[model samples]
Target: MKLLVVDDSSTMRRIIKNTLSRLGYEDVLEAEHGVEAWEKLDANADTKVLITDWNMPEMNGLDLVKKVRSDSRFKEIPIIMITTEGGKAEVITALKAGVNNYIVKPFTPQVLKEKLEVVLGTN
Candidate 1:
């Protein structure tokens, strides 16, 4: 159950990691941006889940998701987007871009867990 967490803010990344830990996901890797995530992905074949933020400096979350899904080696990985964008149109765009699941900002651990369960199934 390896997960790659990509986010710019250290605080946000820590919060996400903590939330995931609360939901019983222990094996977590953190990346400051999408480029770092790509590097990690290329280095680790066992990474199965991705939790990414939409806005980043090196590379945005959307680009990372698109890039991963487009590559044959990484296409099977399930990507869950955690973003601040609450607009319906933005959510639609993320969905169209191949996000396996999505979580808007200000979500509780329970809510995040529910979304993760929906995407990954059975915890």
Candidate 2:
């Protein structure tokens, strides 16, 4: 299965991509923001997961999650929100927005693996 990484920072994006790569999840598409993310997600039917940042230039993670949940095509895809501890409360709103899991700032491979397990319910 493919996954999408949505972040504005090239540095941050590389971190997540590299982390996921080490976790055996290397088929990751990337975007700067939600607008481009959607286009990529729409274009790639193999995309099964979305990891998006909270704030962005064109569209933010909340709006992106809402959009994903609204579309029948992507409604069931697992969404992982990227936020800092300060944004945890807003992440509750993201919960209702259909986020499957979340990762905070300074992410690690173990945490990512655990979060992915929560979302994927994988054994």
Candidate 3:
């Protein structure tokens, strides 16, 4: 199981990568933004899961999700958007855009695991 994580901040990307490692997901591929992620996806067609941040400089999570879901090659991939968009409307917007699951910032590892279990199904 390979998870492709896209985020603008290098620190956040490291954090997410480390978190996934701690969660026992050893194979994590990272990208700085949606564009980079897209390129990686083009090269690595086997990526089954994507974890992206909502607010990014070049391409945001919503746009990434929209693009991925639009493409036939990536439409079926599970997308879990980890965002600071905590408002009800924001969550709904991400969900409507085809996010498989969502995790808000400042959350615990348990929260992440809970959502991942819902999306990825018990690891």
Every candidate's lDDT: 0.86, 0.81, 0.83
Looking at candidate 1, what is the lDDT of residue 63? 93
Better of 1 and 3 by TM-score: 1
| Tens-digit per-residue lDDT, 1-123, candidate 3 | 988999888877776776676667878999988888888988898998999998987788899889889988987898888888899899999999999788888667667666665666544
* lDDT of candidate model 3 versus the reference: 0.83
Candidate 3 regions with alpha-carbon error over 4 angstroms: 108-123
Clash pairs of candidate 3? none
User: What lDDT score goes with residue 15 in model 3?
Assistant: 69
Error of 2 at 114 (Å): 5.6
| Alpha-carbon RMSD of each model | 1.7, 2.4, 1.9
The C-alpha TM-scores of every prediction are 0.89, 0.85, 0.87
Model 1, TM vs. native = 0.89
Q: Residue 100 of candidate 3: its Cα lDDT?
A: 76
